Design an enzyme around this catalytic site. Structure first.
Site, PDB file in Angstrom:
ATOM      1  N   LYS A  69      49.355  37.708  38.141  1.00 45.07           N
ATOM      2  CA  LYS A  69      48.216  36.983  37.429  1.00 45.07           C
ATOM      3  C   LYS A  69      47.959  37.417  36.081  1.00 45.07           C
ATOM      4  O   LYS A  69      48.709  38.581  35.630  1.00 45.07           O
ATOM      5  CB  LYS A  69      46.894  37.075  38.184  1.00 45.07           C
ATOM      6  CG  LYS A  69      46.999  36.482  39.699  1.00 45.07           C
ATOM      7  CD  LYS A  69      45.995  36.533  40.314  1.00 45.07           C
ATOM      8  CE  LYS A  69      44.883  35.411  40.329  1.00 45.07           C
ATOM      9  NZ  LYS A  69      43.517  35.700  40.893  1.00 45.07           N
ATOM     10  N   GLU A  75      43.978  43.848  31.533  1.00 38.83           N
ATOM     11  CA  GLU A  75      43.289  45.021  31.737  1.00 38.83           C
ATOM     12  C   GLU A  75      44.446  46.222  31.698  1.00 38.83           C
ATOM     13  O   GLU A  75      44.086  47.178  31.211  1.00 38.83           O
ATOM     14  CB  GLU A  75      42.521  44.968  32.986  1.00 38.83           C
ATOM     15  CG  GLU A  75      41.303  43.792  32.894  1.00 38.83           C
ATOM     16  CD  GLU A  75      40.580  43.667  34.292  1.00 38.83           C
ATOM     17  OE1 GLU A  75      41.157  44.283  35.222  1.00 38.83           O
ATOM     18  OE2 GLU A  75      39.731  42.858  34.308  1.00 38.83           O
TER      19      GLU A  75
END
Ligand SMILES: Nc1cccc2cc[n+]([C@@H]3O[C@H](COP(=O)(O)OP(=O)(O)OC[C@H]4O[C@@H](n5cnc6c(N)ncnc65)[C@H](O)[C@@H]4O)[C@@H](O)[C@H]3O)cc12
Ligand SMILES: Nc1cccc2cc[n+]([C@@H]3O[C@H](COP(=O)(O)OP(=O)(O)OC[C@H]4O[C@@H](n5cnc6c(N)ncnc65)[C@H](O)[C@@H]4O)[C@@H](O)[C@H]3O)cc12
Ligand SMILES: Nc1cccc2cc[n+]([C@@H]3O[C@H](COP(=O)(O)OP(=O)(O)OC[C@H]4O[C@@H](n5cnc6c(N)ncnc65)[C@H](O)[C@@H]4O)[C@@H](O)[C@H]3O)cc12
Ligand SMILES: Nc1cccc2cc[n+]([C@@H]3O[C@H](COP(=O)(O)OP(=O)(O)OC[C@H]4O[C@@H](n5cnc6c(N)ncnc65)[C@H](O)[C@@H]4O)[C@@H](O)[C@H]3O)cc12
Lengths: 134, 134, 134, 134
Positions: A69, A75
């Site tokens: 993903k 992040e």
């Protein structure tokens, strides 16, 4: 403010990550978790950026869906950037994944000691984390 | 800091090495052992290297599994390198293995006096080690 | 794809590493070097990880500046992780550094045969590397 | 594989040991010599151990510098260990050294017949060795 930032794939919420975050708060860690912080009308970009920058530590739940993903890779790219400036942060967890799959994703993470969910329970993992943070 | 570094294969933990390390601490040796030192998020390379460099002595538990595995050979390479610079360290133990099997692994270790687990007990071996270290 | 990954400190580019990489390509080695591969808008994390994973060999230029910096230690962690899974890779070089300084950094690298830039020239080192890789 | 292992101090290479090893190969002995076998990235420990274990014979060049150094004593430990298991190996040479100096180093080597470089030339010594090995 925050002690820990939790980075995870949404496919793992119900069987693992929701119970984990709930038990960490009960131990007294101040945690950044998206179901607690994000509200209608917020900017996703600006709220995530300030959460990454104001946390002492970060944990990454490595998983087959995590690797594919987009927002999960966003992040982790930000956590390594802050660590390569001199501030150690990353506390890894391996979920349904083997050493060979991790080494094929990145060989540097295979050097870092992780907690394996096939060996430890949820509360057994939660106790291990709080001993480092607190 | 540390007095002794313990190098062993993970197949030998429960029937020999865990009892040994527990009894050495009770005699008062300051010991480097992986279940006591390594924690989540540590780099394996950098923590092992500083353990090898800061210990007065090292013990190696020779065994049929010790010979095959990778990390056991990594540790013994570092001990011999420091000894070939003038600092004597190595204290060998023979576990379920004969002289011929050791001589086929390395003829230089067959020259060094060792403790044999078919002849001595755990506490009888622990008492012998502390008389050298302390 | 790549035959060799080069890991070095940026303080050593102009008097040593740039001439070395240029001569290796002229011998016909396919080399991973940061001035040739990285471009505007790339992720540093993701491009370095795939370079480490897809190279047959890696070389490390040990130096006083190499030891201190962050990104140099990041790369060496990944090389050792892949080698401890059974694939030998590392070809060391010693630049302006002595055996004692290497043994104080890690005793395991002091066991590995290296090329010393006080003894060999740039093209004399380049010829030695290509004989192993090719 | 190898017929003879050569153990020597690096101070003696240029005036004696390089000419000797080059003439032995010309007679057709298959010889283990460090300038022919060791290469960048090899483990020193593991390559030396398999050279000692796979050679039919071993020769030792006794010298004032041989006695002091570390790696020379490492190799002679392994040769005697294999000989004390029933396999005769050692073929000694005396270089710039007297009987009294050898007897002060070990009285058991003073019992073994040796070739003296003050009495015999390089090719005269090489012919003597090949008559035993071949
Ligand atoms: N809480 C969150 C709400 C919304 C978006 C998020 C994105 C990422 N995150 C952060 O990233 C990790 C998860 O990555 P993830 O890759 O699991 O997420 P998804 O892309 O699957 O999105 C999940 C669902 O949000 C729907 N969606 C997409 N844009 C939307 C929008 N403007 N308004 C409403 N709904 C929208 C989309 O339709 C899907 O149903 C976490 O650690 C967390 O910190 C959390 C999010
Ligand atoms: N304490 C330790 C933790 C982790 C790795 C170690 C490696 C070596 N050691 C040192 O070497 C000797 C043992 O050699 P060893 O060869 O017995 O070890 P193994 O390779 O069998 O690894 C054992 C288990 O770690 C799992 N594993 C592999 N990478 C992992 C990772 N990043 N995060 C989590 N788990 C991981 C792997 O799945 C297996 O179950 C000791 O003296 C000691 O000082 C100790 C280790
Ligand atoms: N080619 C490269 C470009 C950019 C960053 C690199 C980092 C590391 N590397 C790799 O690591 C070894 C070198 O370690 P190094 O420790 O020598 O590097 P530095 O940290 O000194 O960075 C060097 C310079 O990049 C400037 N800087 C920092 N972040 C920047 C950014 N986002 N955009 C623009 N410029 C930036 C920073 O201001 C300094 O001037 C090599 O083998 C190589 O593969 C190569 C790099
Ligand atoms: N060929 C060889 C290469 C490297 C080391 C050897 C050690 C021993 N041997 C064996 O032992 C007898 C000689 O004993 P020796 O006592 O004469 O040797 P030295 O200790 O003087 O080392 C000689 C030189 O290697 C330099 N040095 C040390 N560590 C180094 C390293 N990792 N990478 C690069 N260079 C390094 C060190 O700086 C010095 O200049 C022989 O029969 C032979 O079979 C041969 C060696």
């Amino acid at each position: 403010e925050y002690d820990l930032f939790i980075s995870h794939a949404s496919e793992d919420k119900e069987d693992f990550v929701r119970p984990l975050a709930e038990t960490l708060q009960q131990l007294g860690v101040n945690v950044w978790y998206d179901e607690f912080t994000l509200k209608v009308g917020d900017s996703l970009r600006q709220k995530i950026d300030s959460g990454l920058r104001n946390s002492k530590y970060g944990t990454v739940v490595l998983s087959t869906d995590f690797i594919k993903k987009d927002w999960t890779n966003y992040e982790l790219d930000g956590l390594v950037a802050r660590e390569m400036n001199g501030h150690k942060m990353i506390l890894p967890i391996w979920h349904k994944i083997t050493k060979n799959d991790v080494l094929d994703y990145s060989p540097n993470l295979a050097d870092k000691v992780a907690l394996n969910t096939s060996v430890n329970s949820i509360e057994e993992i939660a106790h291990q984390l709080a001993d480092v943070i607190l």
